[PDB]
């Protein structure tokens, strides 16, 4: 995550379950990545339950 974390043009990086700044010590059995491009106004819509 260090190279992703230190990628400068990131604007919004919002998590919902754990701390987002110490992922190196945290290990998971799965990683799911989904990608798309949307309007700015509905950018806040990515929160669940919108």
């Amino acid at each position: 995550y260090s190279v992703l974390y230190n990628l400068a043009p990131f604007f919004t990086f919002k998590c919902y379950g754990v701390s987002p700044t110490k992922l190196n010590d945290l290990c998971f059995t799965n990683v799911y990545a989904d990608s798309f491009v949307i309007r700015g106004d509905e950018v806040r819509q990515i929160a669940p339950g919108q």
Binding site: F10, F11, F13, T21
Partner: protein, 50 residues
């Protein structure tokens, strides 16, 4: 022990006071409560006797 000081989280490698942005976070977050929320997220009142 209790903590009240409101200092912006400088969780980055830059001397950031700022207002918002990358590695420049306001530590406090607001609970939001409404009756539509399901069981397990409605507010609970807690009193501890020592």
């Amino acid at each position: 022990e209790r903590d009240i000081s409101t200092e912006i989280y400088q969780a980055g490698n830059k001397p950031c006071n700022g207002v918002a942005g990358f590695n420049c976070y306001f530590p406090l977050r607001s609970y939001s409560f409404r009756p539509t929320y399901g069981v397990g997220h409605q507010p609970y009142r807690v009193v501890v006797l020592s």
